[PDB]
Amino acid sequence: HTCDYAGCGKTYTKSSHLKAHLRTHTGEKPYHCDWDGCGWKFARSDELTRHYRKHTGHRPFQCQKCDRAFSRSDHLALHMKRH
DNA sequence: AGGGGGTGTGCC
DNA sequence: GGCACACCCCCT
Ligand code: NA
Ligand SMILES: [Zn+2]
Ligand SMILES: [Zn+2]
Ligand SMILES: [Zn+2]
């Protein structure tokens, strides 16, 4: 599975990863946020899922040193480092 | 400090 | 296919 966009030639082992990679060339953002008044659109479905947590307020990653909770694991990891 | 999007990569 | 981690780079 090779990318035939201009002088690229990037290879992938799965179809889904190449199809998502081609979106970085065509600029297509198929995953729209349906929240009222938002308007954000993303090229990968996981970006929209992560973005929805800002609307829903879901904070699954909880710090065990204090009481702060975060919606993303990297935000919790950085919070633990600079604790 | 907290809070976002972009991107690559490995797993289900 | 999506999910999620990890990291980057940005803004607040
Ligand atoms: Na495939
Ligand atoms: Zn390409
Ligand atoms: Zn939104
Ligand atoms: Zn803490």
Author numbering: 430 to 512
Publication passage describing the model:
Krüppel like factor 4 (KLF4) is a key constituent of reprogramming cocktails that transform fibroblasts to induced pluripotent stem cells (iPSCs). Here, we show that reprogramming factor KLF4 undergoes biomolecular condensation even in the absence of its intrinsically disordered region. Surprisingly, the intrinsically disordered region is not essential for KLF4 condensation in cells, and a KLF4 fragment comprising the isolated DNA binding domain (DBD) condenses with DNA in vitro. We propose that bridging and/or condensation with DNA in a sequence- and CpG methylation-dependent manner underlie KLF4 function as a key chromatin organizer and pioneer transcription factor in somatic cell reprogramming.
We determined the crystal structure of the 1:1 complex of DBD bound to a dodecamer containing the NANOG proximal promoter KLFA site. Residues R473 and R479 of ZnF2 (in positions −1 and 6) and R501 of ZnF3 (in position −1) hydrogen bond with the N7s and O6s of bases G5, G6, and G8, respectively; the arginine side chains also make polar interactions with water, ions, and/or aspartate side chains. As in previously solved structures, ZnF1 makes fewer base-specific contacts than ZnF2 or ZnF3. The only base-specific contact made by ZnF1 in this structure is H446 (in position 3) hydrogen bonding to N2 of base G10. KLF4 DBD binds to the GGTG of our dodecamer with the same conformation as it does to the GGmCG of a decamer (87 Cα-atoms superimpose with a root-mean-square deviation of 0.97 Å). We, therefore, used superpositioning to determine if the canonical interactions seen in the DBD:NKA complex can be accommodated at sites KLFA, KLFB, and KLFC in a B-DNA model of the NANOG proximal promoter. However, canonical DBD occupation of both KLFA and KLFB causes intermonomer clashes of the two modeled ZnF1 domains. We conclude that in the observed 3:1 complexes, at least one ZnF1 projects away from the DNA. The four residue ZnF1–ZnF2 linker should allow ZnF1 to adopt different orientations, consistent with tandem ZnFs acting as independently folded “beads on a string”. Single molecule methods show that KLF4 tandem zinc fingers bring together short DNA duplexes in dilute solution by a bridging interaction.
